[PDB]
Structure formats: structure tokens, C-alpha cells
Design a protein around this nucleic acid. Structure first.
Ligand SMILES: [Mg+2]
Ligand SMILES: [Mg+2]
Ligand SMILES: [Mg+2]
Ligand SMILES: [Mg+2]
Ligand SMILES: [Mg+2]
Ligand SMILES: [Mg+2]
Ligand SMILES: [Mg+2]
Ligand SMILES: [Mg+2]
Ligand SMILES: [Mg+2]
Ligand SMILES: [Mg+2]
Ligand SMILES: [Mg+2]
Ligand SMILES: [Mg+2]
Ligand SMILES: [Mg+2]
Ligand SMILES: [Mg+2]
Ligand SMILES: [Mg+2]
Ligand SMILES: [Mg+2]
Ligand SMILES: [Mg+2]
Ligand SMILES: [Mg+2]
Ligand SMILES: [Mg+2]
Ligand SMILES: [Mg+2]
Ligand SMILES: [Mg+2]
Ligand SMILES: [Mg+2]
Ligand SMILES: [Mg+2]
Ligand SMILES: [Mg+2]
Ligand SMILES: [Mg+2]
Ligand SMILES: [Mg+2]
Ligand SMILES: [Mg+2]
Ligand SMILES: [Mg+2]
Ligand SMILES: [Mg+2]
Ligand SMILES: [Mg+2]
Ligand SMILES: [Mg+2]
Ligand SMILES: [Mg+2]
Ligand SMILES: [Mg+2]
Ligand SMILES: [Mg+2]
Ligand SMILES: [Mg+2]
Ligand SMILES: [Mg+2]
Ligand SMILES: [Mg+2]
Ligand SMILES: [Mg+2]
Ligand SMILES: [Mg+2]
Ligand SMILES: [Mg+2]
Ligand SMILES: [Mg+2]
Ligand SMILES: [Mg+2]
Ligand SMILES: [Mg+2]
Ligand SMILES: [Mg+2]
Ligand SMILES: [Mg+2]
Ligand SMILES: [Mg+2]
Ligand SMILES: [Mg+2]
Ligand SMILES: [Mg+2]
Ligand SMILES: [Mg+2]
Ligand SMILES: [Mg+2]
Ligand SMILES: [Mg+2]
Ligand SMILES: [Mg+2]
Ligand SMILES: [Mg+2]
Ligand SMILES: [Mg+2]
Ligand SMILES: [Mg+2]
Ligand SMILES: [Mg+2]
Ligand SMILES: [Mg+2]
Ligand SMILES: [Mg+2]
Ligand SMILES: [Mg+2]
Ligand SMILES: [Mg+2]
Ligand SMILES: [Mg+2]
Lengths: 122, 147, 257
RNA sequence: UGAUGUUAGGAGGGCAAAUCCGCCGAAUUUAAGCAUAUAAUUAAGCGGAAGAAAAGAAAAUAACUAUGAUUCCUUUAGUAACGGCGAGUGAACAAGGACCAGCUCAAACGGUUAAUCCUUCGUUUGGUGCAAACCUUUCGACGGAAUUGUCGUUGAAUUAUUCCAUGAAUGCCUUUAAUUUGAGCAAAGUGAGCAGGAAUGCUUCCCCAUAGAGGGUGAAAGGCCCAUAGUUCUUUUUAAUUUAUUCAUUGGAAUUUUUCAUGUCGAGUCGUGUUCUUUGAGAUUGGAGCACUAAUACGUGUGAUACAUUUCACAUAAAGCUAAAUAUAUGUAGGAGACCGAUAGCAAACAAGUACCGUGAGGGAAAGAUGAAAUAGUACUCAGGAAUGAGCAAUUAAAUAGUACCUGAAAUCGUUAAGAUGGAACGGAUUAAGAGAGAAAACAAGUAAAGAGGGGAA
RNA sequence: ACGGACCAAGGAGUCUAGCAAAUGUGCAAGUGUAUAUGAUUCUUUAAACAUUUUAUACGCAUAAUUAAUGUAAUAUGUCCAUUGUAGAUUUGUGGUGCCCCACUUUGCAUACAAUACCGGUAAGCAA
RNA sequence: AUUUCACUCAUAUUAAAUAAAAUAACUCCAAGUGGGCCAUUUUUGGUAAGCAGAACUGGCGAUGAGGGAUGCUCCUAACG
RNA sequence: UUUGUGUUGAAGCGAAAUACGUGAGUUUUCGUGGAACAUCUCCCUAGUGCAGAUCUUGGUGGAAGUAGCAACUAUUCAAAUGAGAACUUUGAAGACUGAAGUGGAGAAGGGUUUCUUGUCAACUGUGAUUGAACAAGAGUUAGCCGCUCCUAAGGGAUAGC
RNA sequence: AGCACAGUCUUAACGAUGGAUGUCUUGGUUCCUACAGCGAUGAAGGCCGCAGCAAAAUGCGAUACGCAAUGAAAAUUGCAGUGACUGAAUCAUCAGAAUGCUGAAUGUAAACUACACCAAUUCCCUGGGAAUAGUGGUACUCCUACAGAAAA
């Protein structure tokens, strides 16, 4: 790294660490940015995206559309929003996969676990 | 650097500079110093004449620290002094310098060259030669033996 | 270097003359399509290298001390000629003096923004622009060997004692730092070129007469070192030619054929 | 005194080897042939250990104004010396450095009392943990070993000056600085416009930096994400600093004074002769087999040429232990490079010591890439038994990217067109007749009237 | 006379030790900071920087010769620097055009010879 | 013998002619070669040989152009 | 080290040029391609330049629709199935093996080839609806048949040496 | 509706066969740093088994692609299923529990799931009540104790 010699800055090693991460570590990688309004209420800058949160799409062909996250796929590194759909060649309907770093979230769903995190993050 | 090597100039030529009729083969005359005294005799004789045979007595356990002895001639003997100091002695006439050459790494004083006329000097050393000691005496000096 | 015996690890031998094949050694056995192929030799697939590289290649060199010092001295002197500095690629058309000494308040700057403002106010804005625009991704196989970008060389800030220059002038693309008592030729002449742009603090500028024995001081002056001399007293030959003494000894101009 | 015992409590055996210890033991090759020599005190073979092993506290050097256990680095030095004196081979002392350390038996002395040691069974003090467990503790009993020898002293007394260990209670346990594990927090745009399927591009407008290492994200990102600079807690172990006190007993230890006593010091061992190996060691350097076989410190050994008679210096053999500086083609973990880039690099970038071959010991490959996304992998119609083909029908920016899927060369073959063609075909020089392309020299500055733009100055 | 049916990729004077000649560079009767140690060196840095607060580590050179005990380079009349022939450069006059001649002055490098001295050997003496 | 002083021996036509005579003289470091053959004239062995063995010079080899119909060595003549 | 090109299309590849150079080669156009590429300003460095080696690995030819698809006496008529029957099934003929049998039962070796059902991408050197091929399920029953026990030619060990 | 002889060779344009070239890389290679053995308390290696549908590789051991405990903490999936409004679904750590037949292999044997001798063995309640042909021990060499017997 920059100034500590005990960790690597090699393309090979940490490009290997990204694509074989254990499932527990993948949730920290899948994090999104907070809106300005939520950045005053909470001191935090970003959070790991969770299921029932609400988001705004900021990059891609579907930029500008809003909705609610319905599923999270830690193996493909993607999330799915409620009304952003697609047609297969059959005619069957599916969801379009969005990368969580292309998104800003505008409303949380809080519970016991996120409270103890937002408290420390202040 | 391989950039400047001679073999790159022969790179399109057939034989790499060694000849059509006489090849480049491996050891066509022997190995190392092989044929001396048989078919390498002329080279050995005109470039290293006294090579074969032995002469002299044996010395079984040498110990070279017993006979170590560096030398110095009387020419370099006034030059061990600084020039401004050399000036003062040539001016005054009732004083002379006393030089100890062993403190400078010399053991034997040797007698080549010319000392300055009528300029006494006193020299300390372990060994002296006859001519050196005569030259030191002639200009009015003195030799001293130390151990 | 390569692995010690690569390509020679098999029990192969040549079939001999007859059998209407070349006399290269061949892998024994049967039942797999490796059997009977050419085994080792610099012309065979899966064979060995011609002269396998070794670790006892002489990697470094030894350099005489006096020549090193002479070169450092000659590289400081080139840093003080306006024409040479310009020809190395520095954009200094707005500088006032090329030696460029600055007061000791430089030595205790603390934030990068202040250092950038200082550089701009001295007249080096178009030169710090040259550095920012220069970051590009390299061409070739170096990208696979941790050699991604390629940046250009800027000024070299030289100080005597550090109270914040080290950290403030870091993080700016192309900028180097050095302490006066440890001057490095690999920084003063990047890639062998001469005329690096250097910014000297006042204490750094003054220590330079003690380092080279103009004023003597224990543990600072280089011991018994003499500053080198030249074989020419004045390198202006066309001023010598035009002098009256020389001009009166010439001979009338002659004719071509 | 042998033996016996499914009596009680215990140990040895096999695997692994890069570095380490002991034995055994070649030839290829060089000598331009070859036998001594060299290869080599090597490869193959057999045994034994550790995080290092081995070596090691003088029966050592020197010959000086003298040094002072072992190991390793720089030199001594390709030197002294060995050799069909040929090819070839080859040490030691002094000097400069790393590190630094000294001890125990045997033998002498202790008999108004073996003082010594071990098994089993009890019991007794303080600490640490949730628990499991683990430290600390001086008391006893029965039994056995040992005088065919365990333990103490290190020649034994006497004088003075000083030091060490050992018990009682209110006794204090504070701050700081380093050395290592594991966690938390961690600035600054997702702003116009162009073109794009999609900006991380271009052009403009802002900013952060003790953070412009690296990776990810639909195309190149300091300000989109993980991290990065920094900082705060936490776990080890260790230096200072802070606090004692008043009382109790028995043992030890260094010198200093006066005396006596002058001891002991490693045997079929050293050494000599002879035979074979090994060494630079030469009228023999170390080791080994056989024969002979010592002396008692005034002795014994060494001082690089075989003897006899002596002088001088140095040391004290034939018992034992010991950290550091040194090595590491093995195993495991971490970091990195002017290294290779799928015929390259390890044999193996992939279900690689795998598939397959040999009765067996063994031998041993080939094989990477659609797209941003298949949470887009080909729906429907017509022909056909099917395979498959076609479309007005269909995903994609793209299907001449359709899974044998990036790009897609040469050898070799197909289709159409234009030519040539009496037992080879191509080619050099020189022209002509056809066919295909071409305006940058292969013509026209400027003037005048409009129309559409783009700059400079007062 | 031998190799070659065709095409693509691969494919052969290199590395280390030790010596010499040539050339470039630094210093010069000296030259080279060995192994180490030091530092307000520590991503890079395995680089770079430094040298122990009348100054004896070691190599090569400054002196040769002899098996060897060993011995060791004009010589004190003058800090002077052995002798001659040819010879670059310099000094003073004249000739023809700064150049070449003639005379005069100085005498590099080098070539060919002479002489003195040091080590070994022979000869003549020899305490 | 040697050494020192005196006097004197043709030059511009150069102590006989001629001369793309200094393209000279001398050191150092190295390559490749060490199986040859042919023609005129002289010449040894052999009946002789496109046989074997010597001498001087020129060539082929290492070299193409014009001629000898053809031809490694003949005649002319050597190469931007 | 300097100073440059690229989604308004890089490298690569195919055909070319009123182009430059004695030459090795530079440079440019059109097409395909879809992500990187230079530096000639001067220097450093090497696993740095192929027509051959009965060279190594991989791919492809003329020969050529050619040599060939000959042991074991031999086939014919009708019907079923099927997209399609000289070599699948049924009936009728003409024949062979000839008990020293292509008849029955075991050992060595093989390891599911056995059975029933399905079925044809490749194989079954011509065809194929067949098959020992491919797929899904099944199948081996012991006091009396054997091993297991005995000893042989022999093997391995113990005591000692 | 009509007109080109056939073969062979040459040149363009569009295709077939084949897998060079360019770009890519969770792989090699070398150097530097640190640490270091395992086993009768049964090792290294070998064989046999384990999933709802399960061949290889990877992981495990009759509790068998995983149990308990500790730190995170909602999902995990082809179908079927299983999970909260945090000992539960999944990841990591890994100290408790469990760990088939063998192998130095050690009761006797071994192209045998062959054959011995000694002790019957193991649970549940708190002396009763049950189950099971199931469990353990038995190599050789050697040391310290002990035991009796024998010679002298
Ligand atoms: Mg040539
Ligand atoms: Mg040849
Ligand atoms: Mg020859
Ligand atoms: Mg053949
Ligand atoms: Mg290889
Ligand atoms: Mg490239
Ligand atoms: Mg030989
Ligand atoms: Mg030979
Ligand atoms: Mg031989
Ligand atoms: Mg061995
Ligand atoms: Mg063992
Ligand atoms: Mg030891
Ligand atoms: Mg040494
Ligand atoms: Mg030497
Ligand atoms: Mg010998
Ligand atoms: Mg030897
Ligand atoms: Mg020392
Ligand atoms: Mg005793
Ligand atoms: Mg980036
Ligand atoms: Mg960053
Ligand atoms: Mg003794
Ligand atoms: Mg020997
Ligand atoms: Mg001695
Ligand atoms: Mg001892
Ligand atoms: Mg020992
Ligand atoms: Mg690497
Ligand atoms: Mg490979
Ligand atoms: Mg597009
Ligand atoms: Mg691509
Ligand atoms: Mg005909
Ligand atoms: Mg031949
Ligand atoms: Mg042939
Ligand atoms: Mg090639
Ligand atoms: Mg030189
Ligand atoms: Mg004399
Ligand atoms: Mg006398
Ligand atoms: Mg000719
Ligand atoms: Mg004729
Ligand atoms: Mg290129
Ligand atoms: Mg792309
Ligand atoms: Mg090559
Ligand atoms: Mg080729
Ligand atoms: Mg036929
Ligand atoms: Mg058939
Ligand atoms: Mg018959
Ligand atoms: Mg019959
Ligand atoms: Mg019969
Ligand atoms: Mg069947
Ligand atoms: Mg069937
Ligand atoms: Mg067929
Ligand atoms: Mg089957
Ligand atoms: Mg029976
Ligand atoms: Mg028997
Ligand atoms: Mg025709
Ligand atoms: Mg061990
Ligand atoms: Mg098992
Ligand atoms: Mg709990
Ligand atoms: Mg939990
Ligand atoms: Mg058993
Ligand atoms: Mg049996
Ligand atoms: Mg035994």
C-alpha cells in the first residue's frame, strides 16, 4: 500500500481477492451513497444497501427512475428495483441488474441492527 | 552490452567468420596447456624460455613476517619535511633536524642520489647501507641505530 | 533467472542412424502422444534455452568516489544557467532569477493548498499545468508488471531542516524533495539530462559554502576535498579571435578554386 | 546368580531432508595415446539429530617491546609446498572486523556416627480462569537404593573490615516512553453542453489533498464504491519513575593479619616398528590393523630434514558440559522485480503427476478468450419422416459476435469475369496494345456586384 | 555427388572467472574508502550520503639481484641534475617569395654509440 | 685512432639517364590459410597417358564482358 | 527523459499509391476490426532479424475417386414393419455342420458383455429399422456344490553365529 | 426465348478450410523476510463410505459436502424445501464433542472380511431395573521396583 509495507498493491493479488470474496465480506463491498438530506440526519457518508430501502438511479440507460429494492444478489454483484423490467425472447418478464455503486439511496428501513451502526457512525 | 558485439556483423554470412575449409571445431589441438614440449614447443620456447625444470633449495615453513623490510633512498629524505619547515633549516645554521623513518613505515635506508651540500641531518633507522651512511656523514650528519 | 534444469528432465536418447529420422534424442515409451517426440535442445518444442540465464550475472557496478562528487558538482552548476534549464523542458518564462532562492518561511508550510499557491505566485502556473496534464497510461507489457502510469518531472525543493515541507509538497504530481546534506545525482540529473529546476531555501543555500570547504566546520565540511578546476580560463573563443593582438597577426584572406 | 512373571510404572520401532553428523565408495573425463596422477576424499549405497547442528575453554602460537577458548567475513595467496617436477594440485601464523562467557568430574581433605537419593501414601499456604485446568507451598509415614562410595569443601586454623540469604504490620503499588496483535472513524461534483447502447472521453464551471498506492463500476475517475494518508481504543513484554518502617534468628562469603603443610594431576594408554589409506606435509600430516610396550612433574609433549650429547621457550594428552556471531535447490506464511506471456513460463493458467502405455522397476500428454448484460442463449410462420433451410418474423449498438462463439494470415479448394494455349513453366533488357485508378507542378494572380460566415484594433 | 513435396511459428559465438593490448575518464609518487561502522538513511531506499573527535588495516606501484647467509644504484668537490653525432622549438643578421634558404643561438621526444655505478660469476691479491 | 681550429669540394639544371618517387619508415593487436591445378619455354621416370615429379613467368581458383558454334585455364580485354 | 495519437475509432490484418530512398525500409489511401498505441530529443538494455540443419510442433497437397473391399461349396419366392429393407422378423424351398460338430458342461483370463423396455448423433470398413453401440430399470438364495482343514516339492520366521 | 467447345495455366472480386498475428491473464519464475518437525495418547501413505434428486474434483467420518461454542448478522436456491421482526438462512473463527478398515502395525494369518486364549460386557434410576456373541486385553528388545523358586 501507500506507506505500510505489510499489505500488497499488486494487481494480481487483489484482483484475485475481489472475485473470490467470502459471502460475509461481499456485503461491505455492496455499499451505496447517501442523499444530502440523509447526510445531515446521520453523520455517515455511505451504507451497505439492504432489501427494503429506496433508491434513485444515477447512471446507465435507466438514469432518473426511482423505486424500491426487491432483491440482492451477492454472487453477481447486483441489485433489482421494483419497476425496471425486461422481456426475454420468449416474452417472459425479468428484472434488470443494477450495480449498487451506480445508485444513491434516499430512504432507509431501520431496525435493531442498523440503529447500533448509525449510532457508532456519528 | 550485446548491442556492440562483433558477431552481429556476421549475422547473414554463412560461416560466422571462421572459414569454409577449416571449421570451428572443439579442441583441435588439446586441452589447456596440453601439448607443450611436443607440438607446442616453439611457442613455449620463444615466449616462456626458462619454463621447464627446477633450480634451488627448499624452504619448508616460510613465515614472511620475519624478513619484511621496506626501504627508502636518501633523495626522498628531505621531502618528508614540510616546505616551510625545510625553509627554516636552510636559513639557520646551528640547528639540524632529527628524522625517525620507522615512524613513517621504512626500515632500511638506501643510498641512491645526492644530499644537499653543507646541510647536516641526523637520521634514525634500523638498517643502513654503506654508501648511504657515507653520504650522510659527508655533509656533516650522523646515523643512529634503533630497534 | 529461469528454473535450474527446465526441459532436461526426462530419460530420452537418440534412436541412432537408420530408421530414416534425424539424430535428435527422443522421449521413450508409448500410449501417449508425447512418446517419440524431440526431447531437449534449443530448437525443440519443450526443450531447453540456449544459454540459460543465471543469478551470478554481474548486476551492479562500482563507481569511483571522486568522479561521483565531480558529477554532482557539475550538475549543481548546470542548475544555474537559464538557457540550460529551459532546454530541459521547464516552463520558466515568467521567473525572475534562475537560482531562485526563497526565504525560510517555506520550510514550515503545512498544507498542500498553500504550497500550490506559493508555486503559482512565483510565476510557475503554466509549469504546474504541464505536470497535471501529463498523466497517461503506459504502452506495452509494463501494465502487467505494476508500471501503470507515466508522469513528468517537476521542480526539486531543497531544504535544511523539515517542519512541514516534506508533507506539504508531497502529493503534488511530479514534485520531489531533498535535504542539502544528502544530494542525489539520480534526482539532480533525471535520465542523464542536465538543468533540473531547483528551489533553494536560504539556509539550504548558505550551508552550501560550508559543505564544499569555503568555510570550515567539523562534521559538515567534506574532508580534504578540493573543488575541481578547468582546462579553459574563459570559454569565449570568438572574443579572443576579435581582439586586436590576435587580429594583427592574421594573414590576408585567400581564394578558393 | 542366572532364569521366570499378561506383576506396577515407563522407553525404543515408522515417515520427512534444503541446511547438519558418522561410515562406505566408482567410472565417464583431462593428460591430445596410457598404467601413477586427475575427475574426487565427489555421484550412487547404509545409518543418526536440531531450529540450527557440528566445534570449543590450549599437551595452542611465536621468537617480538610479544599475543591468548570455538565459529564466520576481508586479506595472507594461486603464495610455502606436492607432482610420469608433466597435465595439474595447494594449506598455516601475524593483521583488520562480527560476536563475546566460562565451568564440572576424577584425584586431595570431612568417621561421637551417608550429611545423600528415589517410589507410594497423606497434608499446607497464596495467586488466575465462567468452566476445563494451572501455578506456589514446607511438613510427615512406611518401603527401598547406597560404604564394591551418594553429598559437602576445593589444603587446614587464627585475625579485623565489609557484603549475602533468611521471619512480624497498620506498608504503597502511582505517572510516563517504547515494543508487538485485533477493531472503530476517516476530505472533496455524480454540475451544464457534444457525440455515444453505455462516461471514467472532449469543452466549460467548481473543489480536496498529512489522502494523486492499488482494485471495482456499461470507454481512460483525486471529488461514484472498497480501500489509501492520519488518528483513537485494544491485546502482549519492558524500561525508567513512585515508599518504606520498626523490630527478630540462624546460617554463609570476599579480602586483610599471624601461622603450618608442599599434596594430587586420567595405562594395553602414550610411544616405537611394520602394512594400507588420506594430506600441501617432503628419511611420513592424520586415521586404522598387527607386534612390542613407558615415565611420574627434576616428568611428559611441541618448536615442519634422518642422528648422538646438551641449552632455551611454550604447554600441561589419554574424562565431561556450554549461548552469540554462520548455513539453508525442504515445508508454511508475507512482500517485491529494466523477468515469461498459452509451441513461451514449472510437466501441469483447466476434475495435472490427471487420461493413457508397460508383467514390473517406470514413462507421461493435449486442452485459456461470445457479450456491458443470457435476470437478453434465438419466440412465431412455411417446407421437410428427420437433420436442416427460408422469411413479410425476431434479441442486441453489432449475429459475416449463434456457444467448435474476440481478431481471423499462409499453404489448399469453390464461383463469376478477362486473357493465353504445336513435346514444361516462370525470368532479364526494351517497347507496344488493352484494362483499372489518378490532379499534391501537370494554366489564370487580381478586379467588380452580391450573398453566408469567422477574427483583430480605436 | 549429397539435403530440399508445400506453408506458418521456433531455431545457433552467449555468461562467469583470470590476463593482456587499444581507447575514453579521474587523480598523480601515489592510488583504490576492503570487511565493517555512522547518520534528523528508510513507499521507492537492496539506492544515495559519510569515515573513527608530525594521523603505521591490506593490495598494486615507488629497486634490483642471488640457490643462499645476504648485499643494494655517479659522490660532497656542487640545489647540482655524465659524454658525443643527428634532431622539434627559441635568439640575432642577410637572401628569394608568416614560409623556405645562409650564418648565429638553444638542444624536447627519439635513434645510434660511449662512460660511471648496483647484484651474481671468473681472475689477481688476501686478516 | 679520436678531438679542436684554419682553408675548400658541382648544384638554379640537381657530381650519369628516367620516374602519378613520401601511396614513405617503424611499433602494437589480431583473422583466414598451410589437400591445389593449368599454359608457353627448360626438364626427370615410363612404350605411352586427360600418368607421376621439378624450374622461371603468366593465369584458373576468387572473374564477369566481346570472339573461338558449344567449353573453369586460348585471343582481345578486366567491370559505378 | 522529453512531447504526443485514440468511441468524431488504437493495435492487427487484405488490396493498393502520379509518394520517398541505390538499398534494408519509411509514409499514406480504401476496407475489415473494436481497445489501446508511440517517441528520430538524447541515452540505457537483451532470450534482438531464417530458405535450408534425413531441423522441432501443428496444418495441407499431387498421387486418386486410384490400389483395393477374393479363405471358410449357396442361394431363391411371398408377407410384416418402416421415411427408407440383398445382409431385421414370419412362412415356404434348395443346402451345410455330420458326435474328432459354430452340440452340451467347466478352468485360466475378462467384469455386467446377462435380462426386459426404449432407441439411432457417432461406431457396427457396402446398406441397416440390427447389435456385444447408446439410455432407464432389474437379476446371482446352500448343514449335504466348493473354499475353508491335512500334508508335498518348497517359502517366511524364532535361538545362536 | 436465344449465345459461349472441353481441359490446362495466369490475374482480380466474393467465399470455404485452417488457427498464425494483435490485445488480454485469479498462472509460472527468481530474489528478500520470518517461523519450523510428526508418531504406540497410533504418524505419513492406502482402501472403504457420507447429500432429497449426486459421476469427477473439493470437504468430511456411522453425529459423515457437516454438530456444539464464539464474531457478524437475512437470506440460501435447478426444483423441492428451510429461515427474524436474533444460539435459527448464510459467512468467518475454531479451543468442546466425535473421528470407519488398515498401515511401524504389535494375538496367529492373509490373492481368506479365516482361527485362538483370558475377562462375559454395556446401559438407566437411586440397591433395584434392562439390553447385548456385543466390548477390552495378549508382539519383540530394554530400564527401575517387586514376587516367589533354584544353584552356590
Ligand atoms: Mg564475405
Ligand atoms: Mg560450413
Ligand atoms: Mg585442411
Ligand atoms: Mg524415404
Ligand atoms: Mg519450456
Ligand atoms: Mg506490443
Ligand atoms: Mg585421454
Ligand atoms: Mg582426445
Ligand atoms: Mg581412450
Ligand atoms: Mg550421496
Ligand atoms: Mg529414525
Ligand atoms: Mg552442540
Ligand atoms: Mg580465512
Ligand atoms: Mg599478490
Ligand atoms: Mg605424497
Ligand atoms: Mg585435491
Ligand atoms: Mg581480529
Ligand atoms: Mg572423589
Ligand atoms: Mg481507477
Ligand atoms: Mg486514493
Ligand atoms: Mg594430565
Ligand atoms: Mg590421492
Ligand atoms: Mg613455529
Ligand atoms: Mg578437555
Ligand atoms: Mg560437545
Ligand atoms: Mg510475481
Ligand atoms: Mg505449457
Ligand atoms: Mg455505438
Ligand atoms: Mg473484447
Ligand atoms: Mg501431344
Ligand atoms: Mg555426404
Ligand atoms: Mg530426398
Ligand atoms: Mg520466425
Ligand atoms: Mg588503459
Ligand atoms: Mg660493493
Ligand atoms: Mg692481521
Ligand atoms: Mg580472366
Ligand atoms: Mg571450335
Ligand atoms: Mg507498434
Ligand atoms: Mg470494449
Ligand atoms: Mg535467438
Ligand atoms: Mg521456415
Ligand atoms: Mg478398382
Ligand atoms: Mg455386413
Ligand atoms: Mg464336407
Ligand atoms: Mg453333409
Ligand atoms: Mg470323423
Ligand atoms: Mg443381449
Ligand atoms: Mg434390445
Ligand atoms: Mg456402414
Ligand atoms: Mg453400455
Ligand atoms: Mg462336499
Ligand atoms: Mg516341506
Ligand atoms: Mg477454352
Ligand atoms: Mg526431531
Ligand atoms: Mg479410509
Ligand atoms: Mg446465546
Ligand atoms: Mg451466533
Ligand atoms: Mg495382527
Ligand atoms: Mg489359503
Ligand atoms: Mg528383532
Amino acid at each position: 500500500m501507500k506507506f505500510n509495507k505489510q499489505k500488497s498493491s499488486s494487481r494480481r493479488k487483489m484482483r484475485k481477492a475481489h472475485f473470490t470474496a467470502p459471502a460475509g465480506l461481499r456485503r461491505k463491498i455492496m455499499s451505496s451513497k447517501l442523499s444530502k438530506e440523509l447526510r445531515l440526519k446521520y453523520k455517515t457518508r455511505s451504507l451497505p444497501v439492504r432489501k427494503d430501502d429506496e433508491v434513485l438511479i444515477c447512471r446507465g440507460h435507466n438514469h432518473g427512475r426511482e423505486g424500491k429494492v426487491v432483491k440482492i444478489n451477492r454472487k453477481r454483484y447486483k441489485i433489482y428495483v421494483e419497476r425496471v423490467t425486461r422481456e426475454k425472447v420468449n416474452g417472459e418478464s425479468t428484472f434488470i441488474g443494477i450495480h449498487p455503486s451506480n445508485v444513491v439511496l434516499t430512504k432507509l428501513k431501520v431496525d435493531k441492527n442498523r440503529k447500533k451502526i448509525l449510532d457508532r457512525k456519528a | 552490452a550485446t548491442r556492440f558485439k562483433k558477431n552481429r556483423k556476421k549475422r547473414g554470412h554463412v560461416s560466422a567468420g571462421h572459414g569454409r575449409v577449416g571449421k570451428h571445431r572443439k579442441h583441435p589441438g588439446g586441452r589447456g596447456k596440453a601439448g607443450g614440449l611436443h607440438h607446442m614447443r616453439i611457442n613455449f620456447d620463444k615466449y616462456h624460455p626458462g619454463y621447464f625444470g627446477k633450480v634451488g633449495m627448499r624452504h619448508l615453513n616460510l613465515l614472511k613476517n620475519r624478513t619484511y623490510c621496506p626501504t627508502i633512498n636518501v633523495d626522498k629524505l628531505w621531502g618528508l619535511l614540510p616546505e616551510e619547515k625545510k625553509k627554516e633549516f636552510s636559513e639557520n645554521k646551528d640547528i639540524a633536524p632529527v628524522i625517525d623513518v620507522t615512524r613513517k613505515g621504512y626500515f632500511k635506508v638506501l643510498g641512491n642520489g645526492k644530499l644537499k651540500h653543507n646541510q647536516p641531518i641526523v637520521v634514525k633507522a634500523r638498517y643502513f647501507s654503506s654508501v648511504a651512511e657515507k653520504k650522510i656523514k659527508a655533509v656533516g650528519g650522523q646515523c643512529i641505530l634503533v630497534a | 533467472a529461469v528454473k535450474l534444469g527446465a526441459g532436461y528432465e526426462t530419460s530420452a536418447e537418440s534412436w541412432g542412424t537408420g530408421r530414416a529420422v534425424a539424430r535428435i534424442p527422443r522421449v521413450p515409451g508409448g500410449g501417449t502422444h508425447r512418446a517419440g517426440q524431440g526431447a531437449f535442445g534449443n530448437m525443440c518444442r519443450g526443450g531447453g534455452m540456449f544459454n540459460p540465464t543465471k543469478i551470478w550475472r554481474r548486476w551492479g557496478r562500482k563507481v569511483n568516489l571522486k568522479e561521483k562528487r565531480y558529477a554532482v558538482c557539475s550538475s549543481i552548476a548546470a542548475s544555474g544557467v537559464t538557457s540550460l534549464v529551459l532546454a530541459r523542458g521547464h516552463r520558466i518564462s515568467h521567473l525572475k532569477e534562475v537560482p531562485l532562492v526563497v526565504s525560510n518561511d517555506i520550510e514550515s508550510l503545512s498544507k498542500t493548498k498553500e504550497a500550490v499557491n506559493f508555486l503559482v505566485s512565483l510565476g510557475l502556473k503554466d509549469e504546474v499545468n504541464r505536470l497535471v496534464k501529463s498523466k497517461k497510461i503506459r504502452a506495452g507489457k509494463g501494465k502487467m508488471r505494476n508500471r501503470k502510469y507515466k508522469i513528468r518531472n517537476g521542480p526539486l525543493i531543497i531544504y535544511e531542516n523539515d517542519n512541514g515541507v516534506k508533507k506539504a509538497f508531497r502529493n503534488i504530481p511530479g514534485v520531489d524533495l531533498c535535504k542539502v546534506t544528502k544530494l542525489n545525482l539520480l534526482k539532480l540529473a533525471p535520465g542523464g539530462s542536465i538543468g533540473r529546476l531547483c528551489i533553494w531555501s536560504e539556509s539550504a543555500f548558505k550551508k552550501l559554502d560550508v559543505i564544499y570547504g569555503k568555510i570550515h566546520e567539523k562534521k559538515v565540511t567534506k574532508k580534504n576535498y578540493i573543488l575541481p578546476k578547468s582546462i579553459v580560463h574563459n570559454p569565449d573563443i570568438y572574443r579572443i579571435i576579435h581582439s586586436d593582438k590576435v587580429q594583427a597577426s592574421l594573414l590576408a584572406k585567400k581564394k578558393p578554386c
